[PDB]
Structures are given as C-alpha cells and as structure tokens.
Design a protein around this nucleic acid. Sequence first.
RNA 1: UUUGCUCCACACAAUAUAGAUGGAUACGAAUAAGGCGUCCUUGUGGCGUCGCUGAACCAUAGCAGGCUAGCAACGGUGCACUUGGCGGAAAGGCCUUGGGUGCUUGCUGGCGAAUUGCAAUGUCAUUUUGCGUGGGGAUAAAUCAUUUGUAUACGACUUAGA
RNA 2: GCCCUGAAAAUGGAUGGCGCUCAAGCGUGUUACCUAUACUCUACCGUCAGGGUUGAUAUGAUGCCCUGACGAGUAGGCAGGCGUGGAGGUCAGUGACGAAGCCUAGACCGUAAGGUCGGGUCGAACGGCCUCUAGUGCAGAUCUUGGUGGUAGUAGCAAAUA
RNA 3: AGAACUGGCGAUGCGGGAUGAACCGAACGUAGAGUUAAGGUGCCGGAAUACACGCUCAUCAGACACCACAAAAGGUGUUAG
RNA 4: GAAAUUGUUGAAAGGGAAGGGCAUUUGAUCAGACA
Lengths: 106, 172, 197, 111, 127, 49
Amino acid sequence: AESHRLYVKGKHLSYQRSKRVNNPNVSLIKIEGVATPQDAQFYLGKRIAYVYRASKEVRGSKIRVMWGKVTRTHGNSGVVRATFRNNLPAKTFGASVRIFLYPSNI
Amino acid sequence: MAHFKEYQVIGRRLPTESVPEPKLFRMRIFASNEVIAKSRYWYFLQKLHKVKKASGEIVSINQINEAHPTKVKNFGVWVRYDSRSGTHNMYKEIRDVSRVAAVETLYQDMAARHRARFRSIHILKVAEIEKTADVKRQYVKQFLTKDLKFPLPHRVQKSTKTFSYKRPSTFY
Amino acid sequence: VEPVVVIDGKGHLVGRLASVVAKQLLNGQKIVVVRAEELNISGEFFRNKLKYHDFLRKATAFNKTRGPFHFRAPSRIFYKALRGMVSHKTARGKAALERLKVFEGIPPPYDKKKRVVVPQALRVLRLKPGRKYTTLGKLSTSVGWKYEDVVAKLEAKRKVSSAEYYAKKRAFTKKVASANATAAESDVAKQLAALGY
Amino acid sequence: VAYGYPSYSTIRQLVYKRGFGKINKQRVPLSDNAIIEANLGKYGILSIDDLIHEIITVGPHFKQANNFLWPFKLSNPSGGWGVPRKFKHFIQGGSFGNREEFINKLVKSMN
Amino acid sequence: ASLPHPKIVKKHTKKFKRHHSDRYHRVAENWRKQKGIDSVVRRRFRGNISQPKIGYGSNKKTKFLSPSGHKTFLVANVKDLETLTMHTKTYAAEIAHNISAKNRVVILARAKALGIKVTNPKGRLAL
Amino acid sequence: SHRKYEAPRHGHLGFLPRKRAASIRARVKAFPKDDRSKPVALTSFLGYK
RNA sequence: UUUGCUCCACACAAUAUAGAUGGAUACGAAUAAGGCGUCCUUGUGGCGUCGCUGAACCAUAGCAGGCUAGCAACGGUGCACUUGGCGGAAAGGCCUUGGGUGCUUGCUGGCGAAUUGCAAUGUCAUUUUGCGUGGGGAUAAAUCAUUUGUAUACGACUUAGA
RNA sequence: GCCCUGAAAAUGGAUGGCGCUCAAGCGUGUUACCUAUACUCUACCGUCAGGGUUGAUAUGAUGCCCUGACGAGUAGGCAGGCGUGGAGGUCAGUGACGAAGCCUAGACCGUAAGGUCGGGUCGAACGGCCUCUAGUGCAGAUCUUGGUGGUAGUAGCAAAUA
RNA sequence: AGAACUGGCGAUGCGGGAUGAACCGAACGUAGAGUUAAGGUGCCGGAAUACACGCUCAUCAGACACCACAAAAGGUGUUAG
RNA sequence: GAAAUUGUUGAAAGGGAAGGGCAUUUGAUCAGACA
Ligand SMILES: [Mg+2]
Ligand SMILES: [Mg+2]
Ligand SMILES: [Mg+2]
Ligand SMILES: [Mg+2]
Ligand SMILES: [Mg+2]
Ligand SMILES: [Mg+2]
Ligand SMILES: [Mg+2]
Ligand SMILES: [Mg+2]
Ligand SMILES: [Mg+2]
Ligand SMILES: [Mg+2]
Ligand SMILES: [Mg+2]
Ligand SMILES: [Mg+2]
Ligand SMILES: [Mg+2]
Ligand SMILES: [Mg+2]
Ligand SMILES: [Mg+2]
Ligand SMILES: [Mg+2]
Ligand SMILES: [Mg+2]
Ligand SMILES: [Mg+2]
Ligand SMILES: [Mg+2]
Ligand SMILES: [Mg+2]
Ligand SMILES: [Mg+2]
Ligand SMILES: [Mg+2]
Ligand SMILES: [Mg+2]
Ligand SMILES: [Mg+2]
Ligand SMILES: [Mg+2]
Ligand SMILES: [Mg+2]
Ligand SMILES: [Mg+2]
Ligand SMILES: [Mg+2]
Ligand SMILES: [Mg+2]
Ligand SMILES: [Mg+2]
Ligand SMILES: [Mg+2]
Ligand SMILES: [Mg+2]
Ligand SMILES: [Mg+2]
Ligand SMILES: [Mg+2]
Ligand SMILES: [Mg+2]
Ligand SMILES: [Mg+2]
Ligand SMILES: [Mg+2]
Ligand SMILES: [Mg+2]
Ligand SMILES: [Mg+2]
Ligand SMILES: [Mg+2]
Ligand SMILES: [Mg+2]
Ligand SMILES: [Mg+2]
Ligand SMILES: [Mg+2]
Ligand SMILES: [Mg+2]
Ligand SMILES: [Mg+2]
Ligand SMILES: [Mg+2]
Ligand SMILES: [Mg+2]
Ligand SMILES: [Mg+2]
C-alpha cells in the first residue's frame, strides 16, 4: 500500500576479524529484530542485497546491487555472518542492507 | 571445582599371600566426577594409613543421592582450611536442600570470605542439624522464625532492548 | 528502528550511556542526547571533582594550546566519555561521531519530539540503592561551566508548557477512551477480542 | 597427552571413519575388507571388524594389528575442551593425563 | 576453438616487485631477494610484500595456457607457421616483432588457410 | 640543576599574547552590575585623549 | 567586461549521497514508590484500578495501487486558500476558524491486470550545481594607486580624496 | 578476608585508552561465544620415496601412468635455472616494405630470475636452438668519472667620507 | 659476574602478553570450508552490559603470570572464624 | 638522444610527511571468449 517491503532490514557491521586483522571475505550482518542465535537460524541462506547508487547508468539504471547470502550465525546476540559475490566495500560498515525471505522454507 | 556429587569410595590395601583380605576403608567424597573422587580418596588415605594408590586398590565407587531432596535442611559444616599465614579449623552452617547443594556454597563461601581455593579446604564433617536451636549461627537462625515473610524491595527488571520508551519502575 | 533516537540524559550513568551511544553510531544509528546536565556519575561529588582536577592539570608544558583540552559543559564531559569509545581518528569514526548531538536541556525541535531511555544505563536500575553518585550539572558548574542557571531557568519554563501540552492530551484521550467504550460490546469489538485485539 | 578407556563404540567409529593402514608405508585408507585381509590375513583378521575385535579384546596379535593402523589424525574437539586451560591434569580441571571413560566424549568430538 | 581445459587458476596475478623499488629510482622493480640481516621482507613480518615461492606455481594442466586456451608459439615466417598445422587446437602462432609488414599478410593468409590462430593479427596492418 | 638564585619572572603571563589589538577601540568586556531600581542612563562614555 | 543579481514557479540537463523504503508516536517527578480513573473536605486526602516491558500504539487491502457506479454517513484525511492565537534556547515550528476541492477499504457494484515468460533492487528517496525561458523584487561596494601617522621590518593597521 | 593508614620528586599521563562502584573491581563456580601461518577434510605447486610401463604401426625413456609422506631458516653447501660480451654449428632465421636502441599507470607467458607482442620514436644491422668462452649481472664500499637536485631567487653584493 | 641439566633466542615469521629478541600458544608451499590454542567477549574491538554465591566504597579504590615494586607495624571500617 | 632533474598541458589526491600489504566500492582502461 504505502509499505511495499518484502525484505527484513539489516546493518553491515564489520568484516570478520581478530583484534588486529580483518578478513574481508566474511561480513557481519545485524538483522532487525533478531536477538539470538536460535532466531537467526531462520535466516541462514536467505539472500542479502546491498543496494547503492552511482553516477554512470549501466543497463539503464543508476542503481546497483551487490548480492550474497547469510551463511552461519555469529555470537550469542543474533548477529549473522554472510558472504557476498564480491566483498563489501567497508565504507558500508553501518550501511543498510536487505535480507530477502527466499530461499523460502515456510 | 564444579557442580558436586557425593561418592561412597571404598578401597583396600592390596592383598598379600601372608595377609589376604585386608581391611576395607570407606570415605564419602564430594567431587564433580568419579575420577576426581578416586584421586581425592587416595589423597586422604595416604594422609592416614600407610598406603598409596600403587600398593592399593579401590574396591567400589558409588554415588549417594540426597535422601529427601525436596526437604529444606539446616546443615552444620566442619572444615579445615589452610590460609596464607597458617591453617585453621572452622564450623559454618548452611541452610539448603541437599548435602551437595550445601557443599557447593561452602566452597563458594570459603573462596569469597577467606580466599580459599578448592585445594586448601578439607571437609571434616557435614551433618543434618536435627533439632532446631541446635542451629548456632545467627545468619541461619534468622530464617527459622515462625510465620516468616519478607518483601523484595527495589525490583529491577532485565530489559530486552537497548531503548525503553517508558521509564522504569522498581515497584513490586 | 527509527531515523533519529532522542535520549533523555536524565538519570543515566555517563560511562554506560557513552558505551551504548558509541556502539549505536558505529552501527549507523543517529542519536541526540538531551539534558546532559541531569547525567549521573557513580561515586560522591568530591571523588569526581578530584578526578576532574587530575584531568585538569594535564596540559602541554611548552604550549598549553596544543595540549589536552578541558571542556567544562556537561554535554562535553559526556561527548568526551563517548569519543574515547569510538576510534575517532579513523574516517569511519568521524563518520559515526557525526551521527551524534549532545545538549544541555531540551532545546527546539527535540522538545516536542519524544525522548527515550536506556535501561542498561539507568542509574536507578544499576547502582545499588545507597551508593553515592554525582550529577553532571553540579560537577560542571564546579569546574567553570557558566550556564547552569540559564539552563535551569529555560527548562522550568519549557517544563511548564509541556505540562499544558500533556494536560490537554490526557483530556483528549479521556474522550477517546469514552468513545471506545460505546463501541465495546458491538460486533466489531467482540470479533477483534477473539483475534487478540 | 590425554587418554582413557575407549568404548567399543568409539573404536568402531575411529576405524570406520579415520582408520588407515600402513602398506609399504604409504598410509592406505581402509575402505574395503580386502586391504585388511591382504596385509593382516596372516594373523586371522580378514575384515574391518576383525581388526576392531582384535584391538578391543587385546588379542594375541594386538601388536601387529595395532601397528598396522596408521596413527589416527583427529580434529580439535567440536564442543571445545570443556576447560579454560588444557595443560593441567584432568583432576586439576585441565585436559591432560588419564581421564578414564571420559576419553570417549572427547575423542568423539574430535572424530 | 581450443582443446578443452580445466578452469585456469592464476593463483597470484600481481607482479612481484623488488623491495623499495618504489622508494628509490635506482632500484628497479625486477624481483631481487633480500639478503639483509635485519630486513623485514626477508623475515616475513606481517604487512610487508611477499616473495615469490614455489607454492604459487601454476597447475600443470593449465600452465602456459593463455586466456583462449592455446600455448603461444613464436613465428618468423610460413615454414615456422606451418609447424602448427596439426596443432590448431593446442598452439596459437604469435608473429615475431621484427617481421615486416608485407610479410605478415602472407602469414595471416596462410594461418587463415591452415586454421591456425594468430595472437597479434593487427600488427603493422595498413589501415 | 636548580636556578642558583631565586628571582621573580619577567612580565605578566595574564597579558599574553603581546600581539597587536583587533582594533583601535578597545572593547568593553564587562559592564557594571545592574540595579534596576534607579533611573536609566548610560554605563559608559566615549571620547578622545 | 557584452543583459547581470535575487526570491517564487518547471524544464532540461549534470554531480553527488557514512546509506529513505508505513510513523523520531512531546508532561513532570518519584523509584523504601508511581500512572490513570473517580469522589470530596482541594489534601502529603478517600476510593477504584493498572504495571510484571514498545510483543505497544497509530497506520496498513485497491496498476507502486489503474478506470468507474451506488448506498450509509456528516465522519476521516490530502491540498491550496482564509479567521484568530501561541512559540526566541537554535523560536522558523505548533494550535484554532471558515469556505473550496481530492481521496476514502464504513458498506455494495461494473471493468482492467497475462507474454516482465520460474528469481535477477528491477529503479518510486534527497544533494548541490549549471543553462536557457517569465511571475515578483532590487540598482552596490571592495581592492590597486594616491594620501594621514593615533600604525608599521614587509604585509597589516588608521586616515583622507568627485 | 577485602578496605584504610603506614605511602616523599622532579615536562602533563596513563589497569593500553574511554570509563566502570548489587562493576566493566576481588575470590569462586557454570554455560555460551570470538579467532592463529596450529589441528581435520579438499584442490593446486614443489621435494623425497615406493610401484607400473620399450610390443609395433606417431610426437617427449633424463620420459609416461599409479600411490604415499613431507615443505621455517642466518652462516654455509649443493642443485635446477634466468640474463650479458664474444667463439664453433645450425634454422638456406629477422631486416631499409625499417635491424638495433629508446619510450609506453596498453596486452600475454613464467613462482622468479625473465620472456613475448602492440603502439610510438628511430635508422643498419640482428636473433632462436645445440655447443665453446669469459674483463659476465650492483643500491651501498666517507666507492671511480660524469651529470643533477632540494637548500634558493636564499646567504649575500654594507671597509676605503659623495 | 661465573658453573650444571634441559629448553629457547641468535638463524623465526604466525596468535596472545597494548608495547617488547628470549614468556604463553604454536613453528611457516599456494588456497577453500570447518574446529581450536594461548588469550579474550561494556565501548574502543571479533565475541554473553551471560548465569550463580559472597566480598569490597578508598578526600590519590581496584583491575590477571613473566611485568614494569612496596615492608614492619597499626584501624571501635566491614566480613567471616 | 635513456635517467636524475625541469616547463607546459591533462587527470587525481592532500586536517603534523609520503610510500607499502590483504580486500572491495567508484572512475579510467583492456584482453579473451560467444556464435
Ligand atoms: Mg552444540
Ligand atoms: Mg561452535
Ligand atoms: Mg584463560
Ligand atoms: Mg568432526
Ligand atoms: Mg638494521
Ligand atoms: Mg638479526
Ligand atoms: Mg631554589
Ligand atoms: Mg487534588
Ligand atoms: Mg489519594
Ligand atoms: Mg478545518
Ligand atoms: Mg486505502
Ligand atoms: Mg574488560
Ligand atoms: Mg569473577
Ligand atoms: Mg594455510
Ligand atoms: Mg626451505
Ligand atoms: Mg627453474
Ligand atoms: Mg644461460
Ligand atoms: Mg642487443
Ligand atoms: Mg613509467
Ligand atoms: Mg597477446
Ligand atoms: Mg625499431
Ligand atoms: Mg647510416
Ligand atoms: Mg653453453
Ligand atoms: Mg668485472
Ligand atoms: Mg649505482
Ligand atoms: Mg647508494
Ligand atoms: Mg648489497
Ligand atoms: Mg654514487
Ligand atoms: Mg634574480
Ligand atoms: Mg637578499
Ligand atoms: Mg658582509
Ligand atoms: Mg658604500
Ligand atoms: Mg623455556
Ligand atoms: Mg651473530
Ligand atoms: Mg632459532
Ligand atoms: Mg619462534
Ligand atoms: Mg603488560
Ligand atoms: Mg608478541
Ligand atoms: Mg609450559
Ligand atoms: Mg580507545
Ligand atoms: Mg562487539
Ligand atoms: Mg591477583
Ligand atoms: Mg603471582
Ligand atoms: Mg580487620
Ligand atoms: Mg640529436
Ligand atoms: Mg599499489
Ligand atoms: Mg577486442
Ligand atoms: Mg575481445
């Protein structure tokens, strides 16, 4: 109606990392309203999209998308690890991200 | 040392042709598993008889379950504990539902008040205080008064999200 | 959850407000803090007075300008507790710090906006009752903050208008509860009940 | 080290999943009973379970049976170690020494 | 049109440049191994450049294959070019840099005739 | 080591910096406290030396 | 110095973007105490009730939400207007009156949707800028040089000059 | 036991920092969680080892096929290779329709030493392979000779009356 | 400053002890997934503002080995004997 | 007619150096491979 949204909103927090070294191949996602590991097992394998904007049109859109999937859970607070087709830029720490409901299991 | 169990542990003094069937001593031992309890058994026997695990044998190991696990009991406890400057016997009293629960908070107390790690303490005796007013320690006696009641003032509720829209109330 | 989150500073422990405020911006959550003069530090006033003076004597010996800067205002006492929890020399940190505003009192627009609270920083929820604590406005006016009186003046005025506001509002939701009563017992109402509403 | 008394179960699941033979060195996996009979048939022992039997029973040929098995390479435990520090004794709340029947829960998490 | 090959994994695609070849001009980028006693690079301190080593060696299957899938073979003339006649799906001919212009039209022509692929057809082409 | 004879410093640190002023007309940085019971007149005047 | 500047209107063009995607939804104060409703003797009052989390509240159906009819209501809401009033802490936003006009899923109808081919954000936000158009509005100064000396190493300062 | 007194040094300052007080402190217990070039499984490179294979009628016998284990390194040893001047042989090699050289955030091969191509510039010679040979590979030596910077339009160009 | 036995550093990166030749963990071909070690999980900063029983309020509290110091002697502070 | 080093033009970045490693966004540029 006014609300068309088919995804859950999310946050790009960090790369996976130690204290002093980070691995960009894994990104750490915060999923709105998922507070525990058990809650976040629902989202494992759902597909994630980071949707940004750009100057050059390409295929007729000025809007581009990096795609990926939730992979495993992270910690006890329901944060989630994910991997993307290409790794996410790290300017996107704290940027918004969308988790779609597919592949669907319900 | 962990969540505790109690163990009857029985061992004897290996047989010799000249002395078959030696004398069979039992101990009750509080341990978190049966491997500690056997080590612990041998620890005390070498403190009393002339034996060591090499020259001796454990005859049997059995867990003892609390006889009335839902009945509240007043326990007196008897402890010998090394401290930094010297070793001292003690008697504390513990009110709880099982000997195992009792021993648990004993060790916790000896750590908090007297800084005694598990290695320093010896349990000398734990036994049920049968008649009341054989309770000798005031922090237990407090809880034996007839028709006891107390409020739990200033109640604090664990919040499940980082923000709250109300403002808490410690009411209860 | 919301584009901007406004926090009533009043009744919060400085280091536990700063701690959550810091993590929120680093996750991209805008925050504005109001009434930083009603902020609390654990320990009696004298302790945090001395503690501030320890802070106060550190300066660059050859030029006191390059040296550590000492901000007396309760908001800035707070923003310092915060900045230490953010890696503020990274670009990513300057980014996150810019999602922050801290205010003495509740100035315009935020006054008519709703402000929220942080139970894990709430002093009354955390301190053992009977510990001694400090209020930021007392401490700041001690160390040279000039404005405690003007803030308290403006506030008590702002506090009176917001009571007019509230009075009207409690008087309008009195009617709304009344009209909601006639609708009760109707078919719409009874069906919604069964469905949880 | 850490060691204890393995159950038939954990021996069965050690040999089935991680069991390998030594044939002209060369560490060959035991995926068919014919490998075992080939090099252990001399002693009896023509099946993977014959091996397992000759092991747990401590057979007359245990020396040849056991030396035939390449050292099992386990992974780190999956549930972790259950201890904050490995390098005290089991009794002391670490992982080392003889932990008796508890060697099974460990080994199973490492297999 | 080249013989099928497993996916070509390059495994370190980034040139190995000499340490401080960027710092002073007199140090060319050509790889040189550090023999210094103290040197960070020789000690492999985290954060420095990496040195060539034999782990990076390419898969024996796809080695020497260029993106098309043929090894390239240097060609000075038709006789040379013809050595590939039975190999069109395996080797490609690259024309030598000093072959003249009128002579390269001859070699493209015979390569076109023979089904032999040429890696630098447009060189010196009159256009 | 230490000095060897104690002497006061030279000048007043409260008058720094010894730079030139922003303008010829020095600024009134403070005005008298206000007693509003009295009549209204000025608190300062202007003139030339 | 080739018809410039500004505010409002839309247009094409660019360039952005620390990261729109139903709603930041307003007492104060206490916490060994309070909110709310009601009553009175208006109080540090009587009586009732509630919390134990916003898991709420509001909004939410319609081609991303098309074209249309009717009924019941007289309510809701959007827009541009107009009446009166409030807000200076950074007020630059809040309230009220009255017409107009759009929508209304409060209820009942007629029509449309496919082929975007089994998914590919499938593009619906807001930044600044520039270029013409025509609806209002406005027609300066500063610096160099010259000059003073309340100033000055040079710059700078302070004067003076139709 | 914890706490307090005992408890005095020089730039301002450090439980790593912020900060923390029913702790984010001290003792002790229980779970979960995070992440090493380590462990487990897999791919690929190399080293070493064990097997197999001269049967023609095609192309490698120091080869081809199977299988296993292993991989840190100064001084140092050995090995396989890369690159220069010249010499024997050879490809009846490249070239004034452009050799060599030089240039090129253009392309490709090699783990690498390096090799290859395009384009530009250029103007007379030059390369591949098997072998021979050595005045054969530079970042240093307060290295040799030559060239060139920052310093910098800077120090300064003020004795001997004009 | 000088010996003994072993293990290291030197000749050695990697995780940890902020920092650090020698400590703890673990020794290096190029990579993928998983699990861990020592050490950690308020925020900096990956990871429980987890659970549990006590203790402690310091007008220079305290906060983890090697380690970056504190003693006799005292306290009608408080705790347990 | 190399290099150091210099002028111009074009592009880009610059809160107390610069340069470097892994990774990706954006811009520029380019090989190959479809049929
Ligand atoms: Mg599990
Ligand atoms: Mg796990
Ligand atoms: Mg530990
Ligand atoms: Mg496993
Ligand atoms: Mg050195
Ligand atoms: Mg050295
Ligand atoms: Mg003196
Ligand atoms: Mg009243
Ligand atoms: Mg009342
Ligand atoms: Mg109206
Ligand atoms: Mg609607
Ligand atoms: Mg900590
Ligand atoms: Mg603890
Ligand atoms: Mg590896
Ligand atoms: Mg080696
Ligand atoms: Mg080689
Ligand atoms: Mg050679
Ligand atoms: Mg040459
Ligand atoms: Mg260049
Ligand atoms: Mg090519
Ligand atoms: Mg040429
Ligand atoms: Mg000539
Ligand atoms: Mg030779
Ligand atoms: Mg020489
Ligand atoms: Mg040189
Ligand atoms: Mg030099
Ligand atoms: Mg050298
Ligand atoms: Mg030189
Ligand atoms: Mg000049
Ligand atoms: Mg001069
Ligand atoms: Mg002179
Ligand atoms: Mg002169
Ligand atoms: Mg040692
Ligand atoms: Mg030496
Ligand atoms: Mg060594
Ligand atoms: Mg080492
Ligand atoms: Mg340290
Ligand atoms: Mg270290
Ligand atoms: Mg050790
Ligand atoms: Mg910090
Ligand atoms: Mg974290
Ligand atoms: Mg300690
Ligand atoms: Mg110690
Ligand atoms: Mg005492
Ligand atoms: Mg010339
Ligand atoms: Mg680079
Ligand atoms: Mg092309
Ligand atoms: Mg192409």
